[PDB]
Symmetry: C5
Subunit: 292 residues, 5 copies
């Protein structure tokens, strides 16, 4: 059976004439094809006001090294070893659309090497990835957020993102957003290789938002009532004034949750503006009637 001394001999032979910074190909004319695997773990939140979405992923990079291959029959059948991440060449795959708030660095950890040269490198990344949030159809709204991977500095003649496989790990259920992330896309080769996984997000229809809607609809009933009140009821001015105050309060409060960076404003904005305008016109008519 393989032993500690056997693995020591193997590592000593492997790292003898190895340069960490030279691209690992016998012929430098060859490109290194990297295939990436992005497995969303938990969508923490979807921040509207900052136009960010916070999630945690499991990024796996796979490629092939031609200087790190051996015959297992010469080392008592050792078929894989674990090397420190900072001793070996590693593709410079950067998340160039996200703010990487992970608690580990990209040069600490380990990677698994196989006797054929294939390297597996897995990591945890917590990302704050920028999204252009369209709040038009609030609260029945849908969004599309793209997470980008891109080679840092190497041209497509040196390092390439062969493929990107994105899936959902289903580790936890959300109860707030319907997530749909699943597919397999080839990399795009225009000067520097890159790719992106699209995340589609539909807000789930919990009854809490329906309960929040209830006051609005009854306010619709109340405003129509006061605007179709008799001209000489004897409480039109005060009633319309208080209704206008409450409407202004609602119009102010909705803004603090809704985003200001959208292709279109929300129909709810435009509808509450119409309702406030109707309340104001009702108050003006009441004042005119009292004058007359």
């Amino acid at each position: 059976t393989p032993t500690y001394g056997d693995e020591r001999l193997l590592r000593e032979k492997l790292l003898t004439n190895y340069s960490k910074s030279i691209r690992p190909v016998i012929n430098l004319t060859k490109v290194v094809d990297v295939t990436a695997l992005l497995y969303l773990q938990t969508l923490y939140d979807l921040d509207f006001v900052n136009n960010f979405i916070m999630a945690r992923y499991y990024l796996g990079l796979i490629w092939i090294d031609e200087k790190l291959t051996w015959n297992p029959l010469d080392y008592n059948n050792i078929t894989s070893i674990y090397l420190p991440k900072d001793k070996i060449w590693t593709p410079p795959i950067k998340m160039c659309n996200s703010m990487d708030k992970s608690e580990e660095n990209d040069g600490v950890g380990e990677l698994m090497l196989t006797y054929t040269g294939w390297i597996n490198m897995w990591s945890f990344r917590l990302l704050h990835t920028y999204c252009q949030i369209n709040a038009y159809t609030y609260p029945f709204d849908e969004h599309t957020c793209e997470i980008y991977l891109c080679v840092a500095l190497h041209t497509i003649n040196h390092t390439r993102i062969k493929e990107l496989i994105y899936e959902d790990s289903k580790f936890t259920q959300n109860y707030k957003w319907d997530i749909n992330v699943s597919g397999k896309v080839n990399g795009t080769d225009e000067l520097f290789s890159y790719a992106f996984a699209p995340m589609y997000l539909r807000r789930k229809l919990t009854v809490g938002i329906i309960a929040m809607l209830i006051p609005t609809v009854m306010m619709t009933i109340l405003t129509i009532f006061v605007f179709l009140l008799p001209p000489e009821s004897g409480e039109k001015v005060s009633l319309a004034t208080t209704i206008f105050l409450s409407n202004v309060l609602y119009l102010v409060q909705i803004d603090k949750t809704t985003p200001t960076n959208t292709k279109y404003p929300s129909l709810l904005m435009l509808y509450l503006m119409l309702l406030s305008m109707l309340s104001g016109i009702a108050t003006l008519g009441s004042v005119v009637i009292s004058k007359l």
Copy 2:
């Protein structure tokens, strides 16, 4: 008695042909069984809006090294030494459900080594661990939060979490949540080893929340009074209007503390929506009566 020179000789012999990155077993076919000890120290807070809980723990990892054993009779009876954490192989146990906001790194500190090979490695971890918070039964609510440990990259054929012992250190009393963390669970071996400790949290019934409830219940009395007021009292419209304004203010204010990510909304939400709806219907009836 053992001396400084004796310990120098011991360390020099121990670290002679030692490789930090090779798994510490004479026969590489053997697995290293790690037993973990998680001792909650102080539950700082339970953040509802972010669905996180902040606490401080004392994580202890214990395993056995077969290359670091000696006969104490040959070194004047030295039975244990202290080694820097970054000179020895260390299991890659990651907290893969938590945001590790500790102020130390996982490669600075020390570990105790015994002449039989057993290594003790203890550390402080401040964790922001994700929890799915069910606010259904607020303020008589209970929650269950699971803290996960999982081997980083090694398969169950290489590194395993043998066992997880979780307890409560009772270092401080909370006065806000009844904490119940105590047990002993075997590790789960499905590809990569992992385990989790369940924390059950029940909000304590301090009289401060009762005092907060008082205004609500008396408001129930006041709304029933106004809704069962005589049709021609002469203050129904104004009274009901002001009650509705206060009701809307309460319904808005409760939202800012309660969470939006729940299996069900809180009964308090649904009940205050019913109360506000009754107030609105009372105002409509008052308007109809004034019309008639």
Copy 3:
């Protein structure tokens, strides 16, 4: 074709008598001219209250090394290599107007070296750059923010910023600000070299702000109405009082979004102050009339 051994020989010869800290010129009387390229990627936000703007850029530095040149015909036609950033002299170009909140350090990464000595060094920088925000013409306001680059410690006799080319990468569209960053400016040589790229920002006229304006203009109609109400209408005091309350609420709420550090306050401030003063004078006149 060039091979791994050829590149090993090349690097070994290049780095033989190289000093990382000596300025890379054969004759020390010569200056090193650095040309910088700043390519704005995405304008995240424009923070009014903190007088900052958050954006992400792509900073590229180009210069020439005279100790790192070779004849490609002697190494099987190798024409470029990749070196670790911390092995070679690198100009100390600091962003001396910004808070660099990037997640990487200025000594980790790679740089491309060409057989003629020309070095390309590209990086991602997330900057919080200070801007003096003039909110005079809100919400039809325009701003100018200058991003500075400056050599750290070397005098213009040693290191110089030859030129600065700034452009907009058009990676995403904003929908909130009209960005206009494009040009080419020589460096300024007054003791220590520096340069700056001007960003002009005009807030876009989305209909959401128009919807926000609607309540204000109708409030203008309502205040003029109440101030030109008949002296003995019988609701002047109460109506004017409520209008004044709403006016004070709006005047308070506008402050929390607008900045306090401006050459002039916003015309909207001065106009809402005039409107509130008119409402107060109307209330005083109503009180005087009721007295009479």
Copy 4:
């Protein structure tokens, strides 16, 4: 006089056969007694809602090394040197009740060594130390916060905290809290050595809080007036309603400053709840009278 060469010889001889990780005693049966000095510099704030207190301290550790002693007459009377902190054994004294938000690490700096072996090690620590805040007697409230020091991993048979001397440096005056930190406590030896300094904090009676109280007491006068108003005054219902609204606003606003984690709620909570209940009963009586 002593010279640079003399100090070079001294350091070279001292560090020859020195091991950074071996506990610095000739006989390993001996314990190393550490005496700590904690000198509070400025109490920044006392955060009620997070149950933390932020302050800056000056932590000094003193112990004795038996491998770092020399005869000063053999080095031209050199009596003390300065060594880098990371070349020498240093006790692992951790602040195990606090979140260490300092801007330096525990392995960068310097320490003073004396020819007798005595080592002085001084540092700046900014600490966010957890406190259980009893807001019962607000705003005449007193608090007790304990700052803990504890050996990290060594047992009382290896490393001990001999003594802890805590004082107040009086560097600045607070004007918000009366601080009383002064004493001298032996270390506690139960498995692992530790100790704690008690900080007693009494909120100072500035007239600003009295000014804040004034509206409350006059509101007491107003509520008693309305509750002892004649049954048929003709404004009882409206007056009581407005008083109830303002009281509810105060009861809501007080919560946002007061803490939710206390042994008892504040008497101010319970008293304002009594006042709100009395206002509600007054309004109910008014409604009953209007019915009759």
Copy 5:
């Protein structure tokens, strides 16, 4: 002309028998006099509630090394070189009144060395420096903030701050505070050397705050009017009640901007408390009149 090889020889000779941690004097009885230069660049903000002020400075330290001097005629007239900051002895000047939130460390960068031994070391420091803010005369208020420099661990017999020259770089204009920082102060030698630069700050009288004042003064007019209203006007109670509500709202809102840690509260606090008390007494008198 001097060449790369000449500078290589120079550095090799300079660093031959150099110890980074030995104080750089031939005779150890001599003190090293450090002169510091602090050049404020931009005052970002003056945080009232946290009692901090955020600014960016340019700290320059100058001292003399006696082991790093050469004759330029022996190296082809080389007169200055650039060394890495972490290879040479550096005075441990700490900002011991501030929270150093800079993005660089105190051991990365470069320093210029001259053939006479004089070393220049310049750096960027972003500081959050504690200030005791006296808000007595708000908004015509003045403040004094002292920024401290102090040697870390060396006594005045080893390292001294000879002098401190503080100036204002006038890089940007503020428009919010009148800054006056300029002078030259000797260091204070009481055990450990230190010094401080006083910053005087007077809030500028922009017309925005005048506009903010306008509502207050007109409210003074309105409260005097209602308090000197006829006893039987027929709107005294309701008018005084609404005025009192608005007064309470303003008294609450002013607190959130003003500080709680002051020698005296602001005259604006005391004056608005007087105004609120007068409004309350007016309401009480109105109630008494209605009773009579």
